[PDB]
C-alpha cells in the first residue's frame, strides 16, 4: 500500500542513467558545485539494475520524505513517454510511461512528463514542477526562423525535421489538422529517443529536432556545435498518477511549496542551467 512503483525515463538533465559498479552499487560523486549527487537504483531494459540521478530523482526523494512513502524505481520498458493508439479494433491503448501507469506496472510517473489534455483525460497530473515549452535544435550554421519557417511549413526530403516517437510533441502535431502537412513529414523521420535525435543532428543526418526547451537548451549548453531557435509553445512537466491516488493532493501541495521556498530554484540551478 505504502510502497510505490515509480516509472521514469532516460532524459538528461532530468534523469541520468548509468551502470552500477561491480558490487552492484552506485559510484558516489558530487556536483560541479559540491552538492552530493543523490542516486537511486533503477531496473530497466533483458532487464538489469542501473543508477539513476538528476532533477526528477531529487524531486522524487523530496516527495518520498515529505509525504513519507517508500519507492522502487524502474525505467519504462518501451522507452517512450506515452501516446494513445488504436489497437490492432475499437479498443485504444496507451504506450510508454502512460500505459505502465494505467496498467498498474507503475504507481507514479516521475519524469519530464508534459501535461496535456490528451493525457489528462485518463490520469491525474500534479501542478507543474517545471514550466518550459517547445523549441527547435539545429547544427550551428543551419538557418531556420522557427516553427513557421518555409523549409518547415512547406516540407521536402531536402530538409528533414523530426521529433520523438510516441511523445507529447508527436501528439501536438497530430492534434491539429492545420499541422497535417508537417506531421506526415515528421512521422517518416521521428526518432526512438531524444538522445538519438540530438546525436542525429550533430551527425547532420537530422536537420532540425523539435523538442522540450528545458532539454534542448541544456544540450546546446553542453554541446556548442548545437544551437536552438524561441519558444513556439508553452507547457509544463507534472507528476503522473492514476485518478484514484490518495497522494495527488499532497504531491501538488509539496510542489507548490517547493517552488515558493526556492527548492525548485536549487534544482533548476544544479541540473537545468548547468
Amino acid at each position: 500500500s505504502t510502497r510505490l512503483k515509480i516509472v521514469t525515463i532516460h532524459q538528461e538533465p532530468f534523469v541520468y542513467v548509468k551502470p552500477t559498479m561491480s558490487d552492484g552499487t552506485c559510484k558516489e560523486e558530487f556536483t560541479v558545485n559540491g552538492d552530493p549527487v543523490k542516486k537511486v537504483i533503477c531496473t530497466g531494459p533483458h532487464t538489469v539494475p542501473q543508477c539513476c540521478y538528476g532533477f526528477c530523482i531529487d524531486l522524487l526523494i523530496k516527495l518520498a520524505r515529505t509525504m513519507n512513502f517508500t519507492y522502487e524505481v524502474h525505467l519504462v520498458a518501451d522507452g517512450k513517454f506515452g501516446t494513445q493508439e488504436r489497437v490492432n479494433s475499437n479498443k485504444k491503448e496507451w504506450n510508454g510511461m502512460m500505459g505502465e501507469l494505467l496498467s498498474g506496472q507503475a504507481d507514479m510517473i516521475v519524469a519530464p512528463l508534459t501535461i496535456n489534455n490528451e493525457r489528462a483525460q485518463y490520469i491525474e497530473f500534479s501542478k507543474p514542477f517545471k514550466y518550459q515549452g517547445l523549441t527547435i535544435l539545429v547544427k550551428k550554421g543551419t538557418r531556420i526562423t522557427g516553427i513557421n519557417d518555409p523549409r518547415l511549413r512547406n516540407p521536402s526530403d531536402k530538409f528533414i525535421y523530426a521529433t520523438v516517437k510516441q511523445s507529447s510533441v508527436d501528439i501536438y502535431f497530430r492534434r491539429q489538422v492545420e499541422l497535417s502537412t508537417m506531421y506526415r513529414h515528421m512521422e517518416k523521420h521521428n526518432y526512438e529517443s531524444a538522445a538519438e535525435a540530438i546525436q542525429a543532428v550533430r551527425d547532420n543526418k537530422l536537420h532540425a529536432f523539435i523538442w522540450d526547451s528545458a532539454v534542448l537548451e541544456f544540450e546546446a549548453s553542453q554541446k556548442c556545435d548545437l544551437v536552438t531557435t524561441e519558444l513556439f509553445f508553452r507547457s509544463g512537466f507534472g507528476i503522473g498518477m492514476r485518478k484514484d491516488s490518495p497522494w495527488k493532493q499532497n504531491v501538488s501541495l509539496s510542489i507548490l511549496k517547493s517552488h515558493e521556498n526556492g527548492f525548485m530554484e536549487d534544482l533548476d540551478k544544479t541540473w537545468v542551467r548547468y
Binding site: N117, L253, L256
Partner: protein, 279 residues
C-alpha cells in the same frame, strides 16, 4: 438549478476591466454583465448592487469556459478584500467567497499557491507567472537568485533595485533572501508606475516584481528600452488559476477545457489579443 453558477471576480486590468452600463440597459460588444455592491461611504457596511460590464483576458476565458463546459453564471465583483488573505483565521477576497460557498468559482488574476490550495482547489494554470526582474536594456542580471542581488556589496557600484512593498513579492523575498530584503527596503517603490519611471530615469537599476505584470508593461514601454529577464530565470514559478470549492464537481471539465484551449492555440490568440504589446 444546478447549472447556473455564482462566479466571483475582481477588477485588475487587463485581466478584468470594469465599465459602466451604456445607452441600452445591457452589456454589449465583448463584455458580460457583472454586479458590484457599491458602498455608501467609507465608514459603513451599507451599499447598493450596481450593474456593471466586465471584459478582459480572464473574461474571455470565462466566456470560452461557459460555452464549452456548458454552464451559465451570475458574475459579481468581490468587495470584501481583493484576491484573498487569511485574516484572523478568516479568508477574505475572491478565495473567501469560494471557501464560504458564495461562489462556485473565482476567475481573475488569482495566483496559485500552497496556502490557498489548502482551502480551495485550483484549475490548471492558464497564465504563467512568478517573481521576475525588469531592467533598462543594457543592464546585465539574471533573476532573483543572482549574486548581484543576494550579496550586492560584493560588486562596485552596488546594484540599486526594489519592489512595491506590502505584497507577495516582498514577503517571498523576505522569506528566502533576508539580507537582500533588508537591503532593498531603502529602494522600495510606491507603485508599479513609480518603479518604471525610477528605472527610466536611472534612479533604479532593477525592478523586482510579478512576472506577468512585468512582461505586460515591458510590452508597452514607450521606447522599448525596459526589458524583463528570460522566462527560464523566473523565480518561484507558478500561474493564474481558477479557484474552485474543495471537491467541486466542475474542476475536471474546467481543467480539461483549459488544457484544450492551450493545445488548440486559443490561449495564444487571447494573450496576443490582451497581453502581447508592441515591444
Amino acid at each position: 438549478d444546478d447549472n447556473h453558477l455564482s462566479i466571483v471576480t475582481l477588477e485588475e486590468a487587463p485581466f478584468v476591466i470594469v465599465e459602466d452600463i451604456p445607452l441600452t440597459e445591457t452589456c454589449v460588444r465583448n463584455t458580460v454583465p457583472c454586479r458590484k455592491f457599491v458602498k455608501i461611504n467609507n465608514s459603513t457596511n451599507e451599499g447598493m448592487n450596481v450593474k456593471k460590464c466586465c471584459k478582459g483576458f480572464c473574461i474571455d476565458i470565462l466566456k470560452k469556459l461557459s460555452r464549452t463546459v456548458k454552464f451559465t453564471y451570475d458574475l459579481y465583483l468581490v468587495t470584501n478584500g481583493k484576491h484573498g488573505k487569511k485574516v484572523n483565521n478568516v479568508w477574505n477576497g475572491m478565495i473567501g467567497e469560494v471557501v464560504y460557498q458564495r461562489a462556485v468559482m473565482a476567475v481573475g488574476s488569482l495566483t496559485i499557491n500552497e496556502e490557498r490550495s489548502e482551502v480551495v482547489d485550483f484549475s490548471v494554470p492558464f497564465v504563467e507567472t512568478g517573481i521576475s526582474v525588469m531592467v533598462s536594456r543594457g543592464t546585465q542580471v539574471t533573476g532573483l537568485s543572482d549574486k548581484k542581488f543576494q550579496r550586492p556589496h560584493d560588486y562596485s557600484p552596488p546594484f540599486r533595485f526594489g519592489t512595491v512593498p506590502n505584497g507577495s513579492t516582498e514577503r517571498n523575498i523576505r522569506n528566502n533572501y533576508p539580507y537582500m530584503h533588508q537591503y532593498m527596503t531603502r529602494f522600495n517603490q510606491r507603485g508599479v508606475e513609480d518603479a518604471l519611471v525610477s528605472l527610466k530615469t536611472g534612479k533604479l537599476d532593477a525592478f523586482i516584481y510579478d512576472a506577468a505584470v512585468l512582461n505586460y508593461k515591458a510590452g508597452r514601454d514607450e521606447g522599448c528600452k525596459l526589458v524583463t529577464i528570460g522566462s527560464g530565470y523566473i523565480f518561484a514559478t507558478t500561474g493564474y488559476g481558477i479557484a474552485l470549492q474543495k471537491g467541486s464537481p466542475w474542476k475536471r471539465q474546467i481543467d480539461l477545457a483549459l488544457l484544450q484551449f492551450v493545445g488548440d492555440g486559443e490561449m495564444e490568440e487571447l494573450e496576443t489579443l490582451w497581453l502581447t504589446g508592441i515591444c
